[PDB]
Write a protein that binds this ligand. Structure first.
Ligand SMILES: C[C@H](CCC(=O)NCCC[N+](C)(C)C[C@H](O)CS(=O)(=O)O)[C@H]1CC[C@H]2[C@@H]3[C@H](O)C[C@@H]4C[C@H](O)CC[C@]4(C)[C@H]3C[C@H](O)[C@]12C
Ligand SMILES: C[C@H](CCC(=O)NCCC[N+](C)(C)C[C@H](O)CS(=O)(=O)O)[C@H]1CC[C@H]2[C@@H]3[C@H](O)C[C@@H]4C[C@H](O)CC[C@]4(C)[C@H]3C[C@H](O)[C@]12C
Ligand SMILES: C[C@H](CCC(=O)NCCC[N+](C)(C)C[C@H](O)CS(=O)(=O)O)[C@H]1CC[C@H]2[C@@H]3[C@H](O)C[C@@H]4C[C@H](O)CC[C@]4(C)[C@H]3C[C@H](O)[C@]12C
Ligand SMILES: [Mg+2]
Ligand SMILES: [Zn+2]
Ligand SMILES: [Zn+2]
Ligand SMILES: [Zn+2]
Lengths: 46, 161, 50, 99, 72, 154, 1164, 72
């Protein structure tokens, strides 16, 4: 019940980096090359 | 600004949880006495620092008092409290502070202080003993002792013998 | 599923553990001083604060 | 439970509370508003003075009632006397002016 | 006595009526007097209120009788 | 008291349940009455603001009564007896009435004594004693003291 | 005897003037003998003897030794109630700043020294020296120096330099202070400090300086040097059982002060160093602080417990304090409670008192009777007689009780009808027997409630009960003049069953000779109670100057209609009983009887109605069976159709045709609609039945079903509970307010299975949990309102003002929801009401609009009458009887004296208890909305008004808000507004708008309505809103009561032009004062000061009371008392709450004459 | 009062206010819009026959329902 810190401060305190955090919490929409997009059709629900 | 934001956000919200106060109170403060005084003043404001959010009806029903001279006094205390950090209210903390200001003694130092007290009292001894009516009245005391108006050990505790 | 029940057994066991920590204080300190022989496990534990 | 006149509490000289103490009835704030909403100025003055807290007027009321003279000389409640002394025991000097 | 409407009408106030009846009933009870109305084994309260009904009693009459008493 | 606590804290453990005061006075050297009064010495009495509680949020002080009051029935009886004594002394001669009012303490702040009474009657306290006795015997009669009899409580 | 209370700061010398001796030792009693000590807090020399007329040790044991001071213990022989009166004092070895004048928010010491609070606290707890008149040496008066700094500044300055630290420093700062001189310098700066914060605080400080001058206080008295000691019997150390003692917390705090003060004297005598003596002084400071107000320092010192000790400030404040529940709420003698029962034979003026309660309460009266009649020789003999309960104590009880009312009171006294005087009728048993028609006033059912009876003791209180509170005087609700004697459930069912015809009963179409013959026919059983007969009825109509002409005719009525006509008094028409007579029919019957005939015939009529209702309801034989819940046969058809509809909607949802929440809404709607069809079908099955007949053919008449007869007579129940009994139960809520979409297709004539009985539990427990907590704070609105409207009293007969609000109908879009005759009845007209011909004065003026004038008004169709309002009364410190109206608790006009403010508070609070406890939004409702209304809070989205009149014009574009200016047709336009473009406007820049008109849309803040338009505008706004709520739930409460509460609301004025008067400009003043002030100043050759009327929410207006004994009740006692002390205020009592506290008559009721005569004396 | 009769009134108000809120959200009588106000798509015939007066197709409706589920 102390002062509020950013939640990912503790994910860094557990010895993660930003690439690892974003690997944990997100999915990587991968674009390739022009300017082509790999597609997971389920993503674009609308 | 920070605690000012807290005060204004409370006064528009009508309440304050402990969490919001913790987020808004400064970070220099380490003790809980300044924090509880801040909570007391801010409740006097008054905004009624709570633990949980009040119900919608508890805002309408809760009587609001009491502006606004105490409002100004409370705000002028809270705007200044954030600056001085060492502020304290316990007499025990003040005592421990002003006692820690002194530096401890050592064994030979205690010998020095004892001998210096002995020198001071000895100088007092000599100054008094250079007063003749002093020894006259002392002989009179011992005489009225010898008349058994006192004890041969009561008037004085013997000599340096 | 978030709330569980205590009863006499568990509440009384908790109180007895509180008494036991109070005992541990005195027993540690008394085994700190002297530890001399003829000191037995009857003089170190008085039943009142448990 | 009922009571004409019985036991009286030590610090605050009111009739005791409860049936085990043979106590009186709590005439509270809302009953006082109800009495003020009528005109019962005397009803209230005696519920607050003679039937409750005025140690010297309760005995005179009793003597009068057995004398068959229904009149009260109410004096002043012991609750207000204790209040005056307790304000005076702070640094405030509170007092009752010339009549 | 059930409703005091006539006693109230004679005096034209509901607190002053209480006061007039109370002082006349105190005269009739403690100070000692004779009911101006035939008391049918009523307390001094009801006697005073009934008297105020018949017009026999009011504040003017009572102060006038106090004057006459002094002239005694 | 510290010694009593020490010896009890030891004896209860070594002896079983608890030391009865005879057992403490035996283990100690005290006379077992001193021990009992030491036990009876009260301890740190209480805040009279203590809750009772939850019935009305009335602290403890509400139930401690004032036992020094003359209850209004008692004062009524007192003043009734006062008026009755007056109306009885009315049925006495002036000498008897004065000597009984003054020998007792009625309507004066005493409690006069026999020599000081007989000063005002010029008696050397013997005739004054006799006059008091005669008045008391006269008031002793029934049909003169039936009310005063009723004032007796038994 | 005093006529006024004064207050001030107590001088050290005056604190020794009170004292009877200086307490020195900390001890209390002996621990062995328990005797008081020689200088302890419980002394005998200081605080007097322990037994009456008997010194401490015991040398002097006679009352003849009175007043003499013993020699061996010095204890003067007096009464030991003297020990409850005598103060002592404590000679402080160091000055100790009084915590109220330091740690209070403005900090009178701080704002008086013109010094910051932290700086004084640094000088006080021995942080930093302060310069106290440091000569010419470049030293700054009140300039803090620190320790090292004080040393080095003393370096090079062997000269005085006059610097001190500690409470002595503040005492030498205050003592040296010149108050008038600082007032002079502050006036001279206020001359030329014409900037807001500077001259603002200049004036705000010169106010307190001038006040400290006037009050006689010296500035340095706020630094205690002597400390008074509460007397021993106000803080006892009494023994409990078994050597046990119980003390006050005050003794602990006092001992702490005495110990530390004695140790400080020791330290000073022992020449200890600076650290030790400083720390001892800090300790004494904290001890004295905790003694006065424990908790303002932190932390509250705890006793032999975890909880703080209670202190003086605690001994006064808090609900455990003196003001809360020892100055108003007191335990009372000659009183007692029991359990109430019915006693349906009594009259409206009596109550069955048990013989045992009656013999206990009336004890002194009985003793007096036995010794008066000679049945008991002395009071002891009478005591023994009535203790044995002999045979003549009972005759004496009958005689004593004969005309001697008893007040019956039930616990939640929401209004003044929770107290009524009844004549005792002695009964056996131990239950109080309470009249049936009085339960509505008392809110009392006979399932175990209890009542408290009190006994009026004086002739004046006997006449106040008889004349004023007797149960046959109070029959109209004081909130609205409708009679409060409406018969409830067996009565109305009796009158409904008897007054309710059927098509073919015994003896149809006989022509009776009259009601006597109809009753003789029914009681011999020749005719049935509802058998339509021609009956000859003689009704008497006062159609005259009160003449009562008789008229006989031949009506068509049932036999019960005519049997009941025998009880109705003369003036009432015959159509009053010729219909079914449900519940409202009976209430309207009593009401028309009251409007025609008055109070005596109405009381008689009410009793006869109760008697006949109970009698013919018992003869009704109206039981309740299981076959009386006629479940309709078309219930399972309707449920099959609804189930098919939900199955179809679920099939469509499964096919993606709808969403999830959409289909939820659809199915909730389907189930609500099928529930409506089932309820309608069952009530149409239940509300009619077939019957035969004169000629022989079946004929439909209203059903004599018993459950329906009870729901339809209004006696008890309604078609919703009927629906739950035989129709289906429906959809059920959750505590959140969501609706479980699995309905209860069962009823209670059938059963619920385990799942439906579980589902119903949700809403059931929610409702009960709310009703259990609403019961806790049942009377908070009433209390809040009586805080502000308490001192308002009807003090004048006519103010003469011609101001008055224009009462008109409320047309809620369609028709009227409240006509003009209802809103205007009882009010005094302010001007002449002209006929629609516009030349005929219909009702002239000052005409109490009773039902005759009101009918005349509705007849001519005059639909806007200017009536006098309590809010527009020109009276000072009160209201007149004309601007108020009639009483509504008594049919007549208000009396001079009546305390209408408390009546208004209770008349708004008690009816509010029938409103929802939580606000619901549809126009919100519930009690919390009403409380927020009276608190006059600002709505967040204020529809902005037009502050000045003139041509509309805009300005700069989007400085946050779009800017506008209004510029008069001929005047200046210094007012412009930062209108938010979010506030989407309503009028173009090319339409000249009048002043006080809408710019944006949304809720109108009442402050702006009041400031733009008349006070009448704000008052009409407030009454229309709050009555919107009260009509939302169906509750009726008059507008007079809201109007008086509002007049208590807008009772402050703000002065614009101070004129030739003596008022500061930006100041708020009691408007009733500034009115008389400008009136007087305009009387002489001056001109008055013009002000802007204000408005305060009730919790804000009640905080501004002219007195301080009253204001220390419902406020913070500490701030109010500190302010009154530094102001030297005096309370010339002149109030209700203050005279309650101080123990004399209030100026409201019968006390009005006492206060008038007393004001005569005080002005002579 | 009985303490369950007032509870009955509370429960009645609670259920009725809930029922009528969820009824008002239906808006059965309406306008034939024929095309989505979010994506302009053809609101299919069956959805306009079920709910006369829709403004969103089922996709945009369910989308909006998610957001209004959380809040804001
Ligand atoms: C009811 C109250 C609980 C408050 C929560 C408790 C708390 C302290 C209790 C008293 C003290 O122990 C002193 C004394 C001890 C004797 O041996 C038995 C009697 C006494 C008077 C006790 C009675 C009672 O039990 C008390 C008032
Ligand atoms: C009824 C009440 C609880 C109500 C909830 C009970 C619980 C313990 C009782 C007290 C103790 O006996 C101690 C003390 C003994 C004296 O002799 C008479 C007063 C005291 C304070 C008692 C009054 C009362 O009887 C008490 C408060
Ligand atoms: C139960 C309560 C009486 C308790 C005494 C009555 C009095 C006012 C009633 C509400 C209002 O009419 C507004 C609204 C109108 C809608 O059309 C139907 C629903 C609403 C919510 C109603 C529900 C209920 O019926 C209320 C709360
Ligand atoms: Mg009940
Ligand atoms: Zn003595
Ligand atoms: Zn007026
Ligand atoms: Zn769409």
């Amino acid at each position: 019940r102390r002062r509020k810190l950013p939640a990912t401060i503790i994910l860094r305190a557990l010895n993660y980096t930003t690439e690892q955090i974003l690997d944990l919490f997100f999915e990587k929409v991968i674009f390739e090359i022009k300017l082509q997009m790999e597609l997971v059709p389920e993503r674009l629900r609308g | 600004s920070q605690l000012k934001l807290l005060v204004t956000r409370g006064k528009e919200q009508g309440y304050l949880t402990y969490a919001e106060v913790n987020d808004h109170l400064p970070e220099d403060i380490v003790d809980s006495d300044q924090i509880e005084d801040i909570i007391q003043m801010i409740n006097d404001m008054g905004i009624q620092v709570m633990e949980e959010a009040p119900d919608a009806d508890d805002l309408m029903l809760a009587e609001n008092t009491a502006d606004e001279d105490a409002a100004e006094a409370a705000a002028q205390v809270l705007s200044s409290v954030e600056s001085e950090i060492g502020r304290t209210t316990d007499p025990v903390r003040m005592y421990m502070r002003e006692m820690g200001t002194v530096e401890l003694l050592t064994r030979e130092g205690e010998i020095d202080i004892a001998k210096r007290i002995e020198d001071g009292i000895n100088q007092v001894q000599c100054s008094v003993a250079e007063y003749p009516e002093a020894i006259t009245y002392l002989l009179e005391q011992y005489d009225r002792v010898e008349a058994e108006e006192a004890r041969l050990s009561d008037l004085i505790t013997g000599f340096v013998d | 599923g978030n709330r569980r029940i205590r009863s006499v057994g568990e509440m009384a066991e908790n109180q007895f553990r509180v008494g036991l920590v109070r005992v541990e204080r005195a027993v540690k300190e008394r085994l700190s001083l002297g530890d001399l022989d003829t000191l037995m496990p009857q003089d170190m534990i008085n039943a009142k604060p448990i | 439970h009922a009571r004409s006149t019985g036991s009286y509490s030590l610090v605050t000289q009111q009739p005791l509370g409860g049936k085990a103490q043979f106590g009186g009835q709590r005439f509270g704030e809302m009953e006082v508003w109800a009495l003020e909403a009528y005109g019962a100025a005397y009803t209230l003055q005696e519920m607050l003075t003679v039937k409750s807290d005025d140690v010297n007027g309760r005995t005179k009321m009793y003597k009068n009632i057995v004398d068959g003279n229904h009149q009260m000389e109410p004096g002043m409640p012991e609750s207000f006397n204790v209040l005056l002394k307790e304000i005076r025991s702070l640094g405030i000097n509170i007092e009752l002016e010339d009549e | 006595r059930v409703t005091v409407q006539d006693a109230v009408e004679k005096i034209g106030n509901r607190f002053d009526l209480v006061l007039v009846a109370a002082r006349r009933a105190r005269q009739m009870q403690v100070g000692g007097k004779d009911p101006l109305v035939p008391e049918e084994n009523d307390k001094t309260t009801v006697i005073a209120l009934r008297e105020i009904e018949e017009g026999l009693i009011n504040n003017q009459i009572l102060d006038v009788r106090e004057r006459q008493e002094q002239q005694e | 008291i510290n010694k009593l606590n020490r010896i009890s804290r030891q004896m209860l453990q070594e002896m079983g349940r608890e030391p009865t005061p005879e057992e403490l006075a035996e283990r100690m050297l005290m006379p077992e009455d001193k021990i009992r009064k030491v036990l009876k010495i009260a301890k740190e009495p209480i805040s009279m603001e203590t809750p009772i509680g939850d019935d009305e949020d009335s602290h403890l002080g509400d139930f401690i009564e004032d036992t020094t009051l003359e209850l209004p029935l008692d004062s009524a009886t007192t003043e009734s007896l006062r008026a009755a004594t007056h109306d009885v002394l009315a049925g006495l001669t002036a000498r008897e009435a004065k000597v009984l009012r003054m020998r007792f303490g009625i309507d004066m702040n005493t409690d006069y004594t026999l020599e000081e009474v007989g000063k005002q009657f010029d008696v050397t306290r013997e005739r004054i004693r006799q006059i008091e006795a005669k008045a008391l015997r006269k008031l002793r009669h029934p049909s003169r003291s039936e009310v005063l009899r009723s004032f007796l409580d038994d | 005897e005093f006529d006024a209370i004064k207050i001030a700061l107590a001088s050290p010398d005056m604190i020794r003037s009170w004292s009877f001796g200086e307490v020195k030792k900390p001890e209390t009693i002996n621990y062995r003998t328990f005797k008081p000590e020689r200088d302890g807090l419980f002394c005998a020399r200081i605080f007097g003897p322990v037994k009456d007329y008997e010194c401490l040790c015991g040398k002097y044991k006679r009352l003849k030794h009175r007043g003499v001071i013993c020699e061996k213990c010095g204890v003067e022989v007096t009464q030991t109630k003297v020990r409850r009166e005598r103060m002592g004092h404590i000679e402080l070895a160091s000055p100790t700043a009084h915590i109220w004048f330091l740690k209070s928010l403005p900090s009178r010491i701080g704002l008086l020294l013109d010094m910051p609070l932290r700086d004084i606290e640094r000088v006080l707890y021995f942080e930093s020296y302060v310069v106290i008149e440091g000569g010419m040496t470049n030293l700054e008066r009140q300039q803090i120096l620190t320790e090292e700094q004080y040393l080095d500044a003393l370096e090079e300055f062997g000269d005085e330099f006059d610097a001190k630290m500690g409470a002595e420093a503040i005492q030498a700062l205050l003592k040296s202070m010149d108050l008038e001189q600082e007032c002079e310098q502050l006036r001279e700066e206020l001359n030329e400090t014409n900037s807001e914060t500077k001259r603002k605080k200049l004036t705000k400080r010169i106010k307190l300086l001038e006040a400290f001058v006037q009050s006689g206080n010296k500035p340095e008295w706020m630094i205690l040097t002597v400390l008074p000691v509460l007397p021993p019997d106000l803080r006892p150390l009494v023994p409990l059982d078994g050597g046990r003692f119980a003390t006050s917390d005050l003794n602990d705090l006092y001992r702490r002060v005495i110990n530390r003060n004695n140790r400080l004297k020791r330290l000073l005598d022992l020449a200890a160093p600076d650290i030790i003596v400083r720390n001892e002084k800090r300790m004494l400071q904290e001890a004295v602080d905790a003694l006065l107000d424990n908790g303002r320092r932190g932390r509250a010192i705890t006793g032999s417990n975890k909880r703080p000790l209670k202190s003086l400030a605690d001994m006064i404040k808090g609900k455990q304090g003196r003001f809360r529940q020892n100055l108003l709420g007191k335990r009372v003698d000659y009183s007692g409670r029991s359990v109430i029962t019915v006693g349906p034979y009594l009259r409206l003026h009596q109550c069955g008192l048990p013989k045992k309660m009656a013999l206990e309460l009336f004890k002194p009266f009985i003793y007096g009777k036995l010794e008066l009649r000679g049945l008991a020789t002395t009071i002891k003999a009478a005591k023994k007689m009535v203790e044995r309960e002999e045979a003549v104590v009972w005759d004496i009880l009958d005689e004593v009780i004969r005309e001697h009312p008893v007040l019956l009171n039930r616990a939640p006294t929401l209004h003044r009808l929770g107290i009524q005087a009844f004549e005792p009728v002695l009964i056996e048993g131990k239950a109080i027997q309470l009249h049936p028609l009085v339960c509505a006033a008392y809110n009392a059912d006979f399932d175990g409630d209890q009542m408290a009876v009190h006994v009026p003791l004086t002739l004046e209180a006997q006449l106040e009960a008889r004349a004023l509170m007797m149960s046959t005087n109070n029959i109209l609700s004081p909130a609205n003049g409708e009679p409060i004697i409406v018969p409830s459930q067996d009565v109305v069912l009796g009158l409904y069953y008897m007054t309710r015809d059927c098509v073919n009963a015994k003896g149809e179409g006989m022509v009776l000779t009259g009601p006597k013959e109809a009753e003789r026919l029914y009681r011999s059983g020749l005719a049935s109670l509802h058998a339509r007969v021609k009956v000859r009825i003689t009704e008497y109509e006062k159609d005259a100057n009160g003449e009562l002409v008789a008229k006989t005719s031949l009506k068509d009525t049932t036999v019960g209609r005519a049997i009941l006509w025998m009880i109705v008094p003369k003036g009432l028409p015959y159509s009053i009983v010729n219909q079914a007579l449900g519940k409202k029919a009976i209430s309207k019957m009593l009401n028309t009887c009251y409007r025609i005939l008055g109070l005596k015939p109405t009381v008689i009529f009410a009793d006869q109605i109760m008697y006949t209702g109970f009698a013919y309801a018992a003869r009704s034989g109206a039981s309740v069976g299981i076959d009386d819940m006629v479940i309709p046969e078309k219930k399972h058809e309707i449920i099959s159709e609804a189930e098919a509809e939900v199955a179809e909607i679920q099939e469509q949802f499964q096919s993606g045709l709808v969403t999830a929440g959409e289909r939820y809404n659809k199915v909730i709607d389907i189930w609500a609609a099928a529930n409506d069809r089932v309820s309608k079908a069952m009530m149409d099955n239940l509300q009619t039945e077939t019957v035969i007949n004169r000629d022989g053919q079946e004929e439909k008449q209203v059903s004599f079903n018993s459950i329906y007869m009870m729901a339809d007579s209004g006696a008890r129940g309604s078609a919703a509970q009927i629906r739950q009994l035989a129709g289906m139960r429906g959809l059920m809520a959750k505590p959140d307010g969501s609706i479980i979409e699995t309905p209860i297709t069962a009823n209670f004539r059938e059963g619920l299975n385990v799942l439906q009985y579980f589902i119903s539990t949700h809403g059931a427990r929610k409702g009960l949990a709310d009703t259990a907590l609403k019961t806790a704070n049942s009377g908070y609105l009433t209390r809040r309102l009586v805080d502000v409207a308490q001192d308002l009293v009807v003090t004048e007969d006519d103010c003469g003002t011609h101001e008055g609000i224009m009462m008109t109908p409320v047309i809620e879009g369609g028709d009227v929801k409240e006509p003009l005759r209802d809103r205007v009845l009882g009010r005094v007209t302010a001007e002449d009401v002209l006929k629609p011909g516009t030349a005929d004065i219909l009702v002239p003026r000052n005409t109490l609009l009773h039902e005759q004038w009101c009918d005349l008004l509705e007849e001519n169709s005059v639909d806007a009458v200017k009536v006098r309002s309590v809010v527009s009364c020109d009276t000072d410190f009160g209201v007149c009887a004309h601007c108020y109206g009639r009483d509504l608790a008594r049919g007549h006009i208000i009396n001079k004296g009546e305390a209408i403010g408390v009546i208004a508070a209770q008349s708004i609070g008690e009816p509010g208890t029938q409103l929802t406890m939580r606000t619901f939004h549809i126009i919100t409702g519930g009690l919390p909305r009403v409380a927020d209304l009276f608190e006059a809070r600002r709505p967040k989205e204020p529809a902005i008004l037009a502050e000045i009149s003139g041509i509309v014009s805009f300005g700069k574009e989007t400085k946050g808000k779009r800017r506008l200016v209004i510029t008069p047709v001929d005047g200046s336009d210094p007012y412009e507004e930062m209108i938010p473009k979010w506030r989407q406007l309503n009028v173009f820049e090319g339409e000249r708008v009048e002043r006080g008109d809408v710019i944006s849309d949304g809720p109108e803040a009442p402050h702006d309505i009041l400031r733009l338009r008349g006070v009448h505008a704000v008052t009409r706004y407030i009454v229309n809103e709050v009555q919107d709520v009260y009509r939302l739930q169906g509750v009726k409460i008059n507008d007079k009561h809201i109007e008086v509460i509002v007049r208590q609301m807008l009772r402050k004025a703000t002065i614009v032009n101070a004129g030739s008067s003596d008022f500061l400009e930006g100041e708020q003043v009691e408007y009733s004062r500034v009115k008389i002030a400008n009136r007087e100043l305009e009387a002489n050759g001056k001109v008055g000061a013009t002000y802007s009327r204000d408005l305060l929410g009730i919790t804000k207006a009640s905080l501004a009371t002219e007195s301080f004994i009253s204001a220390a009740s419902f406020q913070e006692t500490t701030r109010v008392l500190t302010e009154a002390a530094v102001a030297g205020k005096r309370d010339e009592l002149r109030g209700l709450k203050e005279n309650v506290i101080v123990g004399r008559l209030i100026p409201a009721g019968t006390g009005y004459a006492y206060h008038q005569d007393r004001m005569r004396r005080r002005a002579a | 009062s009985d303490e369950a009769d007032e509870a009955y009134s509370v429960t009645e108000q609670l259920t009725m206010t809930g029922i009528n809120r969820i009824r008002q959200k239906i808006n059965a009588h309406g306008i034939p819009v024929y095309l989505c106000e979010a994506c302009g798509n053809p609101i299919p015939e069956a959805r306009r026959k079920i709910f006369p007066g829709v403004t969103l197709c089922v996709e945009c409706q369910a989308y909006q329902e998610r957001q209004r589920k959380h809040y804001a």
